[PDB]
Amino acid sequence: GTVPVTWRLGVDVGERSIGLAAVSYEEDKPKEILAAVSWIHDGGVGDERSGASRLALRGMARRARRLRRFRRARLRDLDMLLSELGWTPLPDKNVSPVDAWLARKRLAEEYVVDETERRRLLGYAVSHMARHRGWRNPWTTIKDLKNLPQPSDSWERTRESLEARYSVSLEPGTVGQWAGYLLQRAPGIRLNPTQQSLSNATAFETRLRQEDVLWELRCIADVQGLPEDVVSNVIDAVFCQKRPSVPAERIGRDPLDPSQLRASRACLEFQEYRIVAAVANLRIRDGSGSRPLSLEERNAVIEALLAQTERSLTWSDIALEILKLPNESDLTSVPEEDGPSSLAYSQFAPFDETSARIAEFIAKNRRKIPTFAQWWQEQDRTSRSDLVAALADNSIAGLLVHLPDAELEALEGLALPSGRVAYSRLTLSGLTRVMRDDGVDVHNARKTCFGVDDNWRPPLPALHEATGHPVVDRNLAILRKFLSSATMRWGPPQSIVVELARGASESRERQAEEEAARRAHRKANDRIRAELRASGLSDPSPADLVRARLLELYDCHCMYCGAPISWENSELDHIVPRTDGGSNRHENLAITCGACNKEKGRRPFASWAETSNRVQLRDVIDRVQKLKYSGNMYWTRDEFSRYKKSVVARLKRRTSDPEVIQSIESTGYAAVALRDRLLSYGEKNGVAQVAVFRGGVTAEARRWLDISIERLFSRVAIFAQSTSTKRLDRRHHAVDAVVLTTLTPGVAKTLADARSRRVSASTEEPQSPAYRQWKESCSGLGDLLISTAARDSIAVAAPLRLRPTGALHEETLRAFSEHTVGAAWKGAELRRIVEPEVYAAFLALTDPGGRFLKVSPSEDVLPADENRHIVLSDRVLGPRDRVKLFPDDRGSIRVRGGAAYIASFHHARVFRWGSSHSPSFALLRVSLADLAVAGLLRDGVDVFTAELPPWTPAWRYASIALVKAVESGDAKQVGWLVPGDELDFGPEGVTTAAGDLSMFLKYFPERHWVVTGFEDDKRINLKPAFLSAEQAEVLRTERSDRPDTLTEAGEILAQFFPRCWRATVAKVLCHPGLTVIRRTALGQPRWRRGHLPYSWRPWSADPWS
RNA sequence: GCAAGAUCCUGGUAUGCUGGGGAGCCUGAAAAGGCUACCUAGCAAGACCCCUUCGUGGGGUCGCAUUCUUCACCCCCUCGCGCGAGGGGGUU
DNA sequence: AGCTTGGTGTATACCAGGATCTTGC
DNA sequence: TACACCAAGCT
């Protein structure tokens, strides 16, 4: 049922938002906007302070779980070892706290004479060492741990500091001895510091390492006269550690042979493959042409790089030695860094590096492993390559040789060269078998060997393949849903155009750096701007600000000449002229004195001058290096040294710095990933052209096509000067997608060039046939956008998180409160009962027919009964019997014999009861703990419809009216809301506004509000769908930094956010015509009751099933 | 040649929270309370598998990602002649 | 009494490396 | 951060 029409797909990708569009076309002019929508996503971010994604949090949790499991396993193994040695470990309870430290001190300074006492103290010490073994590099083997200096430098400096502090000395200076003596002398001391808290100095300031614990164990065993065998056994058992292993299903399959997994660089196959490649890439001149070298010479130079144990031969020692040529300047096509004095020739040519390193180490340890020498020299080369591949990649979870541990230990710690080439071992062997004989190159060998075409390329990823990047995966999922829906509606797109603006391969730390840079921008220049306005300057120009910042930092100092100068004498000079590859940046400038100004003469700066009098080098940069960071100025310490080093690099250059290149239109991992997936979609489906642009382009297109978001969506001017910012509304992303749909690479290049020329300062109109064709073929886009916005079709949506996964409870466990049965019980005390069975028994006690609990918190509901005996399933509670209580009157669950608060709410089942004229509404706020304790985090259950038992924290803390209504039974569930649902009230808007809500709606009459949380049992938190909260936050930071800068409407908007509309449910859900809109991928409200979340009206929503 | 950085992944560490203990200090001194440490067990709820010790308890992996859960249709891939497990899409 | 208002607690740090891709003249 | 909870103000 898909009707094919001509249309193009415009995609604007941002940092938290993706804009999408589908514009029909007739004759290269936009005919009709089929669908437009802006999608807001979290970027996969689960933790807001750090910005770490949900995938990272899951990985950290799983890693901590595995750590604890392995720690338990190895501690049990140590307990078994201590049982075998007859040493009693440290008991759990009834033990002095300092017994472990006292035992370690006594064992490490004195020799115990009593046998059973010695064994007991040794067990205590060994258990306490294995529980607190310290830190060690995980890759290091136990042997490599033992090779470390004993004791470590860190513990040595800790010893020296503590000697200078406590003025005591104890031989040997172990951590156990001194910590035990501290615990005896000064109790309450901290052995290791804590980040958060009053001024006390701890015992050890630097984290203790595993080698210090090993050294103390060795000292203890030596002074007690223990045999070296049990010393080795307890060292192995205490410091047991799983090997860091890269798991399978993580290394990519070979594109040529997907069944066979890829191969490392250390494989001898790749070694000789790279040798043959380096030989063959040399275009030997022959007959005044680039003829290939002969087969005899090719074989000679191929073999010549396989019999060197070191880096002996070099690149310059190939042409005149083995290539058999009489001149060294006949060689071209070298893939090296071009440079004078034969820079690409002196460096060493690649060889068999794995064999070289292996043979070098073998010659160094001929005595230790002669069997490996035999198996390495007198064994066939294919099995040698197999064994090299085995030894190169043994650091993977999932050794076919089955040797005793003693022989392979000298080889297990030996690491072959790292890295991972793009080809597998089987594929490389098959290629190199049919490469050294036919005398062909890499391309021909690949084309011929596996029967692939000349145009055959490694397959592009499909739209259903996850990229592994959080932001890119979010944008890609939204894009693939939009594109699939658009394809099934109006056929394949005629073309696809995509633009992404920053926010790629950047991490919150990049966001912090950019915000610090702009804060420095707008704060450092204010001093000079005030100085100029006091002087009386009325010409605000950025170049003036830059030169005056240079004046403030440098005190107007021509350093090459002297000659003190002032504001009237600056003469802004460029280190690199615009004619030799220069740009008006903040690093190319230099303060000049007239004499030190025109002496450059287009020559490289500080290059023609240094070989002359009155001006010299080697001393100016000596002062640039010592330029200490000024604490109040633009170039902050995170970038001051960067700017210093960039200036130093630009100062000493003797040739030009190429070149005046523009953006290369593709640099990001997100860019290449999205382009490859869209190209794969087009090749599979039939898209003519796919382009992925940068910037910084659609802004210029909107500027030159006369598109204004403020005029389009009727948005007031938040700023006192000019109009509202481009980012104030959220539909501007979809507007940019619509405008992107028109763009083509040529007109995009022209617009980008015009922007680059303009910002180097007016205004200059672009002039090209392509630009004119675009402009007069897109004059009706303004009318189309006006008609679309006035129809209220451009939507802003957020995808739903419906999967019941995440943290089930708050991470902090809490102590149970405790309460007697036969006392006076309040409603809050009834609600804090931990055990469900006694909870239901008390519910029956207050009222036998009551399925739930309906009590006010502070209301007294139970007197003190001296005969109150409660019958249970397996026990009875006397009047004096005690009952566990949750510590606070909020949602909590029982985990590991403690109390944990419930996490954020997954959803909130909407309950509506009463008359049809005006029914009441209440929310049953449900978190993950409520589904967990109800046994619902399983397969084949509907987490939005399956009921929760009354003892759950959700039903415990429901509103009293809801509890009574559902107790009567008339309260049914009409629907559910999740954080991110939008509320579409209708044309009228919000009729129940009051106070600051009314003041906000005075300027912003939104009809679309997004459910952003459920703060208590009677209220729902809503935010406006079409407004950007980040813009409100930057308004806040501007008004709190700069006063008298915003419009009254801007102040009102900034005051509304970020709490927004903390809205009572009874006032929100009572609006007639309210719709909870679940949009499709295209941005259209879904209304068919299919197998996907559909829109519903709370006033007329029907009961389930 | 041209390093990085980002995304994770694997293995560790210290603190902390809860439960059990106590070295010191402070109250009550009639008795059991607090504080700073330190010791010890656990650190998502749990699911599945191996058991024989058929029950009594011990071992192995998975469990906070893929934002429309579950159900339902379609598509791709894998163990696999039907279909168990991974993904993807679903127009208003 | 039933709304609106503001202020706040929340488990936090580290480490050392393995793939993957890009950079850039 | 930012959301669920907990102190209120006050009309």
Side-chain angles (χ1 to χ4, degrees), chain A residues 1-241 243-1105:
Chain A
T2 294
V3 293
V5 298
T6 300
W7 63 273
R8 320 180 173 162
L9 186 90
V11 185
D12 189 11
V13 162
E15 196 268 329
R16 300 282 163 241
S17 187
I18 190 167
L20 290 152
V23 189
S24 163
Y25 272 65
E26 270 312 277
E27 299 292 300
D28 206 11
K29 297 179 168 60
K31 179 213 155 293
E32 161 193 23
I33 296 184
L34 292 144
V37 56
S38 283
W39 284 96
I40 312 290
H41 51 63
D42 56 4
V45 161
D47 186 74
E48 299 294 329
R49 294 189 332 181
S50 66
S53 60
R54 312 152 163 280
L55 174 82
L57 287 182
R58 178 177 178 268
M60 281 155 58
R62 176 200 56 247
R63 275 194 282 289
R65 288 205 300 280
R66 271 163 91 71
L67 181 149
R68 282 189 268 272
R69 186 168 324 140
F70 187 73
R71 177 179 183 272
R72 150 164 54 257
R74 78 162 152 87
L75 287 190
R76 177 200 70 205
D77 274 0
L78 183 81
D79 291 331
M80 286 212 203
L81 172 73
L82 286 198
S83 173
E84 296 319 309
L85 264 74
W87 304 356
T88 58
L90 199 48
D92 297 359
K93 69 182 94 172
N94 310 134
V95 177
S96 176
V98 288
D99 262 348
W101 301 95
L102 275 186
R104 285 169 67 189
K105 182 178 164 310
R106 213 161 90 79
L107 286 161
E109 66 183 1
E110 284 303 317
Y111 167 66
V112 191
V113 289
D114 200 334
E115 183 55 45
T116 186
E117 184 173 340
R118 156 174 48 240
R119 300 197 144 187
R120 200 192 80 251
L121 292 184
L122 276 185
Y124 285 3
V126 162
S127 288
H128 188 284
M129 297 181 145
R131 260 84 181 169
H132 310 259
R133 51 192 194 166
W135 178 85
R136 173 184 97 214
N137 187 300
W139 300 107
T140 60
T141 307
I142 288 185
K143 162 68 170 306
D144 276 25
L145 158 73
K146 292 166 53 55
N147 287 100
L148 294 157
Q150 302 297 320
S152 62
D153 180 285
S154 164
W155 172 240
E156 281 175 46
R157 274 261 321 290
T158 303
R159 275 181 74 219
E160 305 281 10
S161 56
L162 290 193
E163 279 137 10
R165 164 211 301 271
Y166 297 129
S167 68
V168 293
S169 294
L170 293 94
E171 300 292 326
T174 67
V175 60
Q177 285 186 196
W178 271 39
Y181 151 76
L182 272 166
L183 289 200
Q184 296 294 141
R185 174 290 291 290
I189 191 167
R190 297 287 294 167
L191 313 185
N192 285 263
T194 296
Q195 191 89 325
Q196 202 150 299
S197 187
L198 299 165
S199 58
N200 305 69
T202 65
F204 321 115
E205 151 186 10
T206 300
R207 195 63 61 72
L208 61 83
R209 332 170 48 78
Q210 265 198 15
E211 65 249 40
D212 306 329
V213 171
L214 168 79
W215 170 65
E216 186 178 3
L217 192 146
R218 180 180 315 287
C219 291
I220 282 187
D222 202 86
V223 306
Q224 297 279 125
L226 273 179
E228 281 274 69
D229 182 73
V230 298
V231 180
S232 71
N233 272 316
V234 303
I235 283 164
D236 288 307
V238 159
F239 303 123
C240 177
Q241 213 163 290
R243 206 51 190 260
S245 66
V246 177
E249 211 76 40
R250 183 140 172 100
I251 311 297
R253 317 277 200 147
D254 211 36
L256 278 298
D257 219 326
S259 77
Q260 191 66 35
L261 182 163
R262 217 159 300 158
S264 301
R265 165 195 279 153
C267 287
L268 317 177
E269 297 98 348
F270 170 69
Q271 290 288 317
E272 58 88 17
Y273 187 75
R274 193 194 43 167
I275 285 150
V276 178
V279 173
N281 281 132
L282 313 167
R283 290 283 183 275
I284 294 281
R285 188 213 66 90
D286 197 80
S288 297
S290 60
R291 262 193 61 114
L293 79 167
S294 89
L295 204 51
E296 193 270 331
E297 279 151 325
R298 187 181 252 203
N299 290 318
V301 188
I302 278 160
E303 197 60 46
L305 313 183
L306 278 155
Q308 302 160 189
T309 47
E310 317 192 17
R311 312 208 66 211
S312 62
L313 268 293
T314 181
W315 267 120
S316 53
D317 285 1
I318 303 298
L320 311 158
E321 284 77 3
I322 303 94
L323 277 171
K324 277 153 187 40
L325 267 74
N327 259 315
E328 80 176 11
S329 190
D330 289 342
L331 189 61
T332 47
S333 298
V334 292
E336 298 305 323
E337 208 180 8
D338 284 338
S341 186
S342 72
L343 197 50
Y345 286 135
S346 49
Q347 319 311 128
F348 300 100
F351 50 78
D352 197 349
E353 193 192 26
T354 304
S355 299
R357 293 181 185 179
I358 281 183
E360 176 77 27
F361 210 96
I362 277 175
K364 299 290 98 176
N365 68 3
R366 290 294 302 255
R367 198 191 162 214
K368 201 167 303 198
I369 51 171
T371 298
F372 185 55
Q374 180 81 250
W375 204 8
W376 164 263
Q377 305 272 26
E378 298 283 352
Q379 191 55 250
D380 196 32
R381 212 203 162 82
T382 179
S383 75
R384 190 162 85 185
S385 294
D386 165 88
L387 209 61
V388 160
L391 271 296
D393 202 1
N394 74 328
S395 165
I396 279 184
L399 300 94
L400 286 78
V401 60
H402 308 327
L403 290 166
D405 309 341
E407 202 276 330
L408 61 86
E409 179 173 334
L411 268 159
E412 162 78 27
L414 175 60
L416 292 190
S418 80
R420 164 71 26 82
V421 308
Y423 269 67
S424 158
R425 58 169 306 283
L426 188 153
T427 302
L428 268 186
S429 297
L431 289 194
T432 58
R433 191 186 70 184
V434 187
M435 182 179 72
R436 295 180 68 187
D437 314 319
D438 274 320
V440 292
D441 46 342
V442 166
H443 182 25
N444 198 4
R446 178 196 292 107
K447 197 206 311 297
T448 295
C449 277
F450 285 95
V452 305
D453 294 331
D454 175 35
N455 275 24
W456 184 90
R457 322 291 209 94
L460 307 157
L463 263 191
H464 62 76
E465 283 173 63
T467 187
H469 213 257
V471 182
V472 187
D473 216 329
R474 292 296 193 213
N475 294 320
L476 188 153
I478 290 157
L479 161 65
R480 81 164 92 96
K481 295 183 186 68
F482 189 70
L483 182 52
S484 169
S485 300
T487 304
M488 81 195 47
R489 277 276 268 116
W490 316 294
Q494 188 274 331
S495 69
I496 279 157
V497 61
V498 176
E499 173 172 347
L500 59 90
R502 202 75 44 190
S505 68
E506 292 160 14
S507 178
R508 291 287 207 223
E509 206 265 358
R510 185 51 50 199
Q511 183 86 38
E513 280 213 37
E514 301 294 332
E515 71 87 21
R518 59 93 190 166
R519 183 176 292 165
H521 277 105
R522 207 87 50 180
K523 295 318 159 267
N525 63 352
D526 211 10
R527 290 165 176 158
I528 297 169
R529 267 162 172 275
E531 288 163 349
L532 292 196
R533 295 182 202 98
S535 188
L537 283 81
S538 72
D539 296 350
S541 198
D544 291 331
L545 309 187
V546 181
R547 58 188 280 171
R549 154 171 86 236
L550 298 176
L551 294 204
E552 209 274 344
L553 188 45
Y554 302 141
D555 214 339
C556 318
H557 193 276
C558 168
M559 315 209 317
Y560 293 166
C561 80
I565 61 171
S566 83
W567 169 252
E568 73 187 356
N569 198 345
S570 292
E571 299 143 354
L572 272 183
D573 193 54
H574 292 346
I575 297 169
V576 193
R578 84 151 191 71
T579 58
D580 291 331
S583 177
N584 196 346
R585 312 211 212 94
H586 67 281
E587 57 266 45
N588 208 40
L589 281 180
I591 175 61
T592 46
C593 53
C596 55
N597 166 44
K598 280 172 82 139
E599 280 181 348
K600 175 168 77 58
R602 211 166 149 168
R603 281 301 299 257
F605 189 76
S607 185
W608 178 88
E610 64 159 10
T611 314
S612 67
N613 49 4
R614 207 185 153 282
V615 294
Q616 278 300 306
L617 209 48
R618 219 177 65 201
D619 295 344
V620 169
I621 292 175
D622 191 284
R623 302 318 185 107
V624 179
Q625 288 275 64
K626 69 150 197 65
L627 189 50
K628 185 264 290 181
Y629 161 74
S630 293
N632 46 354
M633 59 77 77
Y634 162 57
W635 292 314
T636 194
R637 217 199 296 273
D638 202 90
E639 211 178 339
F640 192 53
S641 300
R642 301 211 286 236
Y643 156 87
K644 278 148 66 144
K645 294 316 210 318
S646 180
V647 164
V648 165
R650 295 184 97 96
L651 276 168
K652 276 162 153 160
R653 54 95 178 171
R654 287 95 61 101
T655 184
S656 74
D657 46 357
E659 60 93 12
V660 180
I661 194 159
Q662 201 155 251
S663 75
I664 67 169
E665 190 276 331
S666 84
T667 50
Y669 167 47
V672 298
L674 288 181
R675 180 186 24 247
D676 288 331
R677 306 214 155 73
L678 292 156
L679 280 166
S680 179
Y681 163 76
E683 290 181 354
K684 183 64 182 293
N685 190 359
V687 170
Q689 184 171 358
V690 174
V692 173
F693 292 163
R694 211 196 296 250
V697 174
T698 318
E700 299 303 315
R702 280 198 342 265
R703 219 186 87 71
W704 293 120
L705 192 151
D706 189 19
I707 296 299
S708 178
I709 312 149
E710 311 87 352
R711 305 207 328 265
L712 196 68
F713 299 118
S714 45
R715 278 314 184 251
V716 305
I718 58 170
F719 274 31
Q721 68 100 45
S722 178
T723 67
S724 83
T725 311
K726 174 222 172 163
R727 292 283 208 244
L728 175 64
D729 194 293
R730 284 192 217 166
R731 286 156 300 174
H732 82 276
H733 299 298
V735 163
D736 291 331
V738 168
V739 179
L740 262 172
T741 300
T742 74
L743 286 168
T744 57
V747 65
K749 181 88 61 203
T750 61
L751 289 168
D753 182 74
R755 203 212 72 157
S756 62
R757 299 190 179 290
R758 182 192 79 199
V759 302
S760 181
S762 63
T763 73
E764 201 64 28
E765 184 74 28
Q767 214 80 1
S768 70
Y771 166 68
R772 210 75 38 73
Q773 194 53 270
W774 160 58
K775 194 154 70 157
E776 286 55 70
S777 58
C778 287
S779 77
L781 197 52
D783 181 24
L784 266 179
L785 281 191
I786 287 286
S787 55
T788 303
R791 275 190 278 111
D792 194 66
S793 287
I794 307 181
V796 174
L800 319 166
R801 179 172 264 281
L802 304 191
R803 215 160 287 148
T805 76
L808 317 169
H809 51 78
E810 296 293 328
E811 199 161 354
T812 294
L813 282 80
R814 292 180 184 280
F816 279 145
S817 296
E818 184 66 26
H819 203 266
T820 61
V821 171
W825 281 38
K826 318 193 167 310
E829 274 149 16
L830 283 177
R831 274 200 313 203
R832 290 157 75 195
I833 294 169
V834 177
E835 319 94 308
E837 303 174 15
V838 64
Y839 187 92
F842 272 105
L843 297 196
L845 194 151
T846 78
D847 62 357
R851 200 165 60 121
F852 298 84
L853 184 47
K854 43 182 77 68
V855 289
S856 168
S858 45
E859 160 193 22
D860 272 28
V861 298
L862 261 185
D865 180 22
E866 210 55 43
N867 319 315
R868 182 178 293 137
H869 271 271
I870 303 166
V871 65
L872 265 65
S873 174
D874 283 25
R875 194 191 320 91
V876 74
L877 314 174
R880 214 72 72 170
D881 198 9
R882 312 212 72 95
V883 170
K884 282 173 298 187
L885 259 58
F886 290 116
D888 291 331
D889 189 39
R890 54 183 288 173
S892 299
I893 50 157
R894 181 168 45 179
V895 285
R896 295 170 260 129
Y901 293 157
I902 65 176
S904 291
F905 289 109
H906 185 237
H907 62 278
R909 306 172 191 213
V910 183
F911 282 92
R912 171 207 81 215
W913 69 97
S915 83
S916 300
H917 196 225
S918 78
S920 287
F921 286 83
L923 300 188
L924 181 71
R925 307 173 299 143
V926 175
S927 43
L928 284 178
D930 317 300
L931 307 155
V933 306
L936 303 168
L937 295 200
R938 68 182 188 271
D939 284 14
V941 65
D942 189 9
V943 297
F944 298 119
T945 302
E947 70 273 17
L948 312 185
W951 52 267
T952 45
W955 270 122
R956 266 178 205 211
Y957 292 84
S959 83
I960 311 289
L962 160 63
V963 176
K964 304 160 99 57
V966 69
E967 188 53 90
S968 188
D970 50 43
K972 300 293 183 289
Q973 193 204 351
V974 301
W976 46 268
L977 316 170
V978 301
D981 290 331
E982 76 170 358
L983 297 183
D984 173 278
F985 289 150
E988 48 268 51
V990 185
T991 77
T992 60
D996 313 332
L997 178 61
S998 287
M999 301 305 327
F1000 171 83
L1001 192 150
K1002 171 163 215 312
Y1003 315 102
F1004 314 90
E1006 293 83 3
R1007 53 174 288 192
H1008 288 108
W1009 301 85
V1010 176
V1011 185
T1012 190
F1014 314 99
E1015 67 179 0
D1016 60 54
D1017 49 312
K1018 294 179 295 185
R1019 317 172 89 186
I1020 178 176
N1021 273 38
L1022 312 170
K1023 65 175 184 180
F1026 295 159
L1027 284 191
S1028 200
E1030 291 316 300
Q1031 190 59 227
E1033 165 194 294
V1034 302
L1035 294 181
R1036 264 195 279 283
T1037 199
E1038 174 83 342
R1039 95 191 191 301
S1040 278
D1041 287 332
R1042 161 153 159 195
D1044 186 74
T1045 186
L1046 293 182
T1047 302
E1048 205 195 24
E1051 285 276 352
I1052 287 296
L1053 165 66
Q1055 295 298 109
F1056 197 66
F1057 282 72
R1059 304 301 201 81
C1060 276
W1061 184 17
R1062 309 173 36 166
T1064 300
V1065 167
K1067 275 177 183 328
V1068 160
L1069 277 297
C1070 73
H1071 280 92
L1074 199 158
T1075 58
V1076 182
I1077 292 301
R1078 280 75 178 272
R1079 313 193 89 82
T1080 66
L1082 304 176
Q1084 291 323 296
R1086 184 179 291 109
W1087 284 100
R1088 283 162 260 206
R1089 296 192 91 141
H1091 291 277
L1092 287 186
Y1094 49 87
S1095 304
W1096 55 289
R1097 294 190 149 86
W1099 277 70
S1100 277
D1102 310 337
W1104 299 92
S1105 70

